Design a protein around this ligand. Structure first.
Ligand code: ZN
Ligand code: ZN
Ligand code: ZN
Ligand code: ZN
Length: 332
């Protein structure tokens, strides 16, 4: 896929929410991947649809080809308030698969991003993340594998679940708690990276059993470390969720305070402390102790909601973190 080792992945508003529309060619080159937000659904909650917020279909395709020629990736994100996906059975699953492939074919997207919240949860008795039994989860995994298999090894697959669905699995396994764990595990060989939303999250319990507060360096390290290292699920020491490759692990952050109205924004100064600890093993006097002393140098980078918020906030996120990653001189 020719993706770099330290990425900035930015969500791109296919809409004007007050922050304005940025045409694709006007997006800062500091973003490596652009997650077009969002493919949406109608009555049947399964047929995904997408139309460019500006200009014609042909021109949007051309814009995407241009970006791709510059080494960027353009990914279709599925989710948002108007992108609820429900796959209770095979019929629904097929509408989903076919509609997504049609959109990828039409616009030349490099892959898809799963940003689903509503609709995802574990049924009773669904107890094993390696072998899920909830139809929504089973069918989403199947659809994702089918789509990725359709496009081959270069297909880009990402996802942006909220913490309850991933790290929350440390506390409970059922309902929304840990509900993305089977999805992640089920598609791990196809997964390019996961960027959990470390925002609008309140607090989170680390693998050390301690509580950490969103928007702090300790919290960022504690939450990422769970995917970098793996962790016991639902208080069961014998049910360990395995580590992902470090190059599959990113952290999702708000570009500006207002990009996450319930909190989660962290200053670049504090975030760089977290990054230096995660990547280089260099501590910063925090309470959280990293699982691997020497660090996880192949940690993949940062995601942000969003490109549009970033541009409205003096490009603080993109400028700070591009410089940080560009300045790394990792040896190994
Ligand atoms: Zn939410
Ligand atoms: Zn096929
Ligand atoms: Zn949300
Ligand atoms: Zn260990």
């Amino acid at each position: 896929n020719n993706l770099g080792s330290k990425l900035l992945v930015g969500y791109w508003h296919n809409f004007d929410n007050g922050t304005g529309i940025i045409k694709l060619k006007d997006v800062s080159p500091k973003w490596d991947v652009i997650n077009v937000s969002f493919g949406e659904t109608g009555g049947d909650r399964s047929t995904v649809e997408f139309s460019p917020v500006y200009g014609t279909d042909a021109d949007f395709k051309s814009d995407i080809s241009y970006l791709k020629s510059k080494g960027k990736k353009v990914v279709l994100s599925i989710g948002g308030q108007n992108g609820v996906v429900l796959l209770p059975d095979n019929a629904a699953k097929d509408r989903f698969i076919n509609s997504i492939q049609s959109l990828i074919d039409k616009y030349g997207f490099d892959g898809i991003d799963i940003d689903l919240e509503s609709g995802i949860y574990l049924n009773g008795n669904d107890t094993n993340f390696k072998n899920p039994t909830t139809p929504q989860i089973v069918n989403l995994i199947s659809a994702i594998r089918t789509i990725s298999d359709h496009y081959g090894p270069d297909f880009l697959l990402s996802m942006a679940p909220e913490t309850a669905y991933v790290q929350g699995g440390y506390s409970a396994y059922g309902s929304i708690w840990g509900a993305y764990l089977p999805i992640i595990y089920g598609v791990k060989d196809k997964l390019t990276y996961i960027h959990v939303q470390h925002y609008n999250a309140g607090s989170g319990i680390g693998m050390d059993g301690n509580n950490y507060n969103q928007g702090t360096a300790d919290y960022e390290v504690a939450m990422a470390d769970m995917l970098l290292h793996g962790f016991p699920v639902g208080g069961n020491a014998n049910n360990i969720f395995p580590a992902l490759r470090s190059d599959q692990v990113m952290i999702g952050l708000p570009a500006a305070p207002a990009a996450a109205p319930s909190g989660g924004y962290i200053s670049p100064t504090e975030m760089k402390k977290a990054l230096n600890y995660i990547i280089k093993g260099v501590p910063f006097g925090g309470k959280y102790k990293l699982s691997n002393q020497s660090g996880y140098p192949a940690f993949r980078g940062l995601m942000s909601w969003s490109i549009n918020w970033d541009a409205k906030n003096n490009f603080e996120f993109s400028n700070n973190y591009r410089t940080y990653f560009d300045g790394l001189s990792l040896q190994k």
